[PDB]
């Protein structure tokens, strides 16, 4: 009973066939909002698949499109189209970060910003200047700047029904890594953990330009092909098989993780998570039940021996209980309600 | 008699102590507008030196500042500052490129955009969408998108008086290269010309992140220390001594050059330019008088024999005649009048 604009990043399709976190959350939120009878306009790439109105400034995902060199050009096209049409919307829900803040002061339609990223020494200064806007965080640990006007915390979610549940892991045990090959995700940690426990590690993910040196130096020399396997970038079925077959997923971050969608994807498949307790991991993992919070590699190494005891079905039930689209979209509805009323 | 906003890039100080083309043009334009009684607000780094109003979102030039990783944050900070105060100005003069186009449709004060860059396969798409805006080209050959509403072509200018004139080049002859060490400027070409003419080459310029590989592979292995010299980025006095002492400046571009300030800087010192006839070279160099338009390495080599034959003093007068601050600022004043009238 509202007109809602969803402004997504253009790096990935909505929803992404493989890598993509925000575009996934935007897809789930958008589709469910439309089902609830709202007039939704999706601002996303041209190959996106939505039942809402799709306005696109480029036909394809930009990350893997070979003809595009300047992503910022089409980002600016998107924001120009959105805020030029402000009075065609009751609320604008932006997922593109700080690039939308100077536009918000120039239009009358209220804008809601879901923060999907880490606060940095630089972006804090632009967020500071626009602190009295309606931000929504995806985890409590993310709120490192309290002077911002957080309307609410709305945890992310996945479509649990679409993830196949695995009752028992693969007959010869192996560990899984799923994520972009970045130091922030610590795949080098994951490689050390598997070698010291003696259990193989299967890796999947992208290696975009910023991590090529890191992959060339720390990761690639260790990809054995037998004990350390790497299947670059995985679509939904491939990733669902990878975590499901594993006894546990290594999530050894070295970085203030905003949320970590792979964790709830692992648990949804029934595979618990051995993670280091940084950022949102303590809020996502229930220690000793759906996984194990660790503070060191050895803590993670020791925890892998206590992984078989966990109830794998409890992991899936846990994801259903707190990380469902039903709850997320309802919480996002509460946000729109508040923003339109407390203006 | 107008209130004018000057929106500069933040990579370099206004004025730049060393490298910096666009930031230099903004200085001469800003100071001269103030002298003519305009209420000018300059948006640039906090260490800028202006007699106009200085609004800064970061205190220093960002290119060499080690604490900044996200330039787009402060660019957005600046663009937010300008258009939030749009009705404090009669005209906004933007030099930051396409990132300001979506703002122009959202504010009431008319905006004039000076194009300082090359049209790209990507950036063409955002300019097309905003073609009915007030663009100003710095050369006619730059107008690769004719469908834009060009108000006028306004060639750039330099402060000729600040460049010392050199009547006779250095006693043992040498060739000069001045520019960013980029393939677009073809410094490797200049080295091919050096050995074929038998005259040494003195090189000056920056090597920023994008051209470090280009530098290590194509340029650096050839730096003798005697025949090929590189003095890593030069401030104003050093670069003027570099050009003045040279018999000619090599400008072997490989790229649709928007203008090329080093060309009128070389001539200002009295040094003619051996350039490849791409982009703005035919409009900046008077062939056979202040330099030589060339079409290959061999065509440049042949021109070096005909360089001691040109009048060096005619070069300085040429820059005074067409590329003076007086002429540029008056033409930009005419542009301001037209934009305010044909609104
Ligand atoms: O401060 C580190 C900075 O890295 C970010 C930039 O916002 O990572 C994104 O950009 C890099 C490009 O180098 C990508 O490797 C990375 O996948 C990006 O992650 C974000 O952008 C994707 C595309 O939309 C989303 O799918 C993803 O959900 C999102 O995390 C940030 O992580 C961080 O701010
Ligand atoms: O189309 C090529 C693309 O290269 C640009 C990037 O926008 O070059 C600028 O940024 C590169 C680094 O990638 C620098 O080497 C270069 O100095 C830059 O040139 C422009 O930006 C400076 C800072 O404002 C100006 O001082 C300079 O005069 C200007 O040419 C662009 O040239 C272009 O878009
Ligand atoms: O090979 C991969 C690697 C990642 N993803 C997905 O892209 C999203 C990544 O989100 P996450 O929060 O876990 O990491 P980040 O956003 O910080 O890159 C998740 O849905 C992953 O399942 C994927 O499909 N394939
Ligand atoms: O060591 C250097 C190298 C370059 N420049 C200046 O950087 C500017 C570059 O302008 P130009 O148009 O010639 O090249 P571009 O803008 O495309 O980089 C010129 O004023 C140069 O004088 C400089 O001062 N010192």
Automatic annotation (TrEMBL), chains A, B:
<dbReference type="InterPro" id="IPR050194">
    <property type="entry name" value="Glycosyltransferase_grp1"/>
</dbReference>
<feature type="binding site">
    <location>
        <position position="19"/>
    </location>
    <ligand>
        <name>UDP</name>
    </ligand>
</feature>
<feature type="binding site">
    <location>
        <position position="262"/>
    </location>
    <ligand>
        <name>UDP</name>
    </ligand>
</feature>
<dbReference type="Pfam" id="PF00534">
    <property type="entry name" value="Glycos_transf_1"/>
</dbReference>
<feature type="binding site">
    <location>
        <position position="185"/>
    </location>
    <ligand>
        <name>UDP</name>
    </ligand>
</feature>
<feature type="domain" description="Glycosyl transferase family 1">
    <location>
        <begin position="167"/>
        <end position="306"/>
    </location>
</feature>
<feature type="binding site">
    <location>
        <position position="239"/>
    </location>
    <ligand>
        <name>UDP</name>
    </ligand>
</feature>
<keyword id="KW-0808">Transferase</keyword>
<feature type="binding site">
    <location>
        <position position="20"/>
    </location>
    <ligand>
        <name>UDP</name>
    </ligand>
</feature>
<feature type="domain" description="Glycosyltransferase subfamily 4-like N-terminal">
    <location>
        <begin position="20"/>
        <end position="121"/>
    </location>
</feature>
<feature type="binding site">
    <location>
        <position position="265"/>
    </location>
    <ligand>
        <name>UDP</name>
    </ligand>
</feature>
<dbReference type="InterPro" id="IPR001296">
    <property type="entry name" value="Glyco_trans_1"/>
</dbReference>
<protein>
    <submittedName>
        <fullName>Glycosyl transferase</fullName>
    </submittedName>
</protein>
<feature type="binding site">
    <location>
        <position position="261"/>
    </location>
    <ligand>
        <name>UDP</name>
    </ligand>
</feature>
<dbReference type="InterPro" id="IPR028098">
    <property type="entry name" value="Glyco_trans_4-like_N"/>
</dbReference>
<feature type="binding site">
    <location>
        <position position="234"/>
    </location>
    <ligand>
        <name>UDP</name>
    </ligand>
</feature>
<dbReference type="Pfam" id="PF13579">
    <property type="entry name" value="Glyco_trans_4_4"/>
</dbReference>
<feature type="binding site">
    <location>
        <position position="180"/>
    </location>
    <ligand>
        <name>UDP</name>
    </ligand>
</feature>
<keyword id="KW-0547">Nucleotide-binding</keyword>
<dbReference type="GO" id="GO:0016757">
    <property type="term" value="F:glycosyltransferase activity"/>
</dbReference>
<dbReference type="GO" id="GO:0000166">
    <property type="term" value="F:nucleotide binding"/>
</dbReference>
């Amino acid at each position: 009973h509202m007109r809602i604009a969803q402004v997504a990043p253009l790096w990935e399709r909505v929803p992404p066939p493989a890598y993509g976190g925000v575009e996934l959350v935007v897809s789930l939120l958008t589709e469910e909002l439309v089902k609830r009878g709202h007039e939704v306009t999706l601002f996303a790439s041209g190959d996106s698949m939505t039942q809402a109105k799709l306005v696109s400034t480029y036909p394809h995902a930009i990350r893997l499109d070979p003809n595009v060199q300047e992503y910022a050009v089409y980002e600016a096209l998107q924001l120009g189209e959105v805020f030029s049409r402000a009075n065609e919307f009751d609320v604008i829900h932006s997922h593109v970060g700080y690039t939308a803040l100077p536009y918000t002061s120039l239009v009358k339609t209220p804008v809601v910003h879901t923060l999907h990223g880490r606060f940095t020494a630089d972006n804090e200064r632009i967020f500071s200047q626009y602190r009295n806007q309606n931000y929504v965080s995806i985890s409590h640990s993310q709120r490192q700047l309290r002077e911002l006007n957080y309307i609410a915390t709305v945890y992310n979610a996945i479509a649990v029904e679409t993830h196949h549940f695995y009752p028992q892991p693969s007959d010869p045990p192996y560990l899984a890594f799923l994520g972009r090959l970045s130091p922030e995700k610590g795949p080098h940690h994951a490689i050390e953990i598997a070698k010291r426990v003696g259990i193989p590690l299967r890796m999947a993910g992208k290696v975009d330009r910023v991590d090529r040196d890191y992959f060339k130096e720390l990761i690639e020399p260790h990809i054995d092909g037998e004990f350390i396997q790497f299947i670059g970038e995985a679509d939904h079925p491939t990733k669902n098989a990878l975590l499901g077959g594993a006894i546990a997923m290594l999530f050894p971050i070295t970085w203030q993780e905003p949320f970590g969608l792979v964790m709830i994807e692992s648990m949804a498949a029934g595979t618990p998570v051995v993670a280091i307790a940084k950022g949102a991991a303590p809020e996502v993992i229930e220690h000793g039940k759906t996984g194990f919070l660790c503070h060191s590699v050895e803590d993670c190494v020791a925890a892998v021996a206590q992984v078989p005891q966990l109830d794998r079905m409890a992991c899936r039930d846990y994801v259903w209980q707190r990380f469902s689209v039903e709850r997320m979209v309802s919480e996002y509805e509460a946000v729109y309600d508040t923003v339109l009323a407390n203006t």
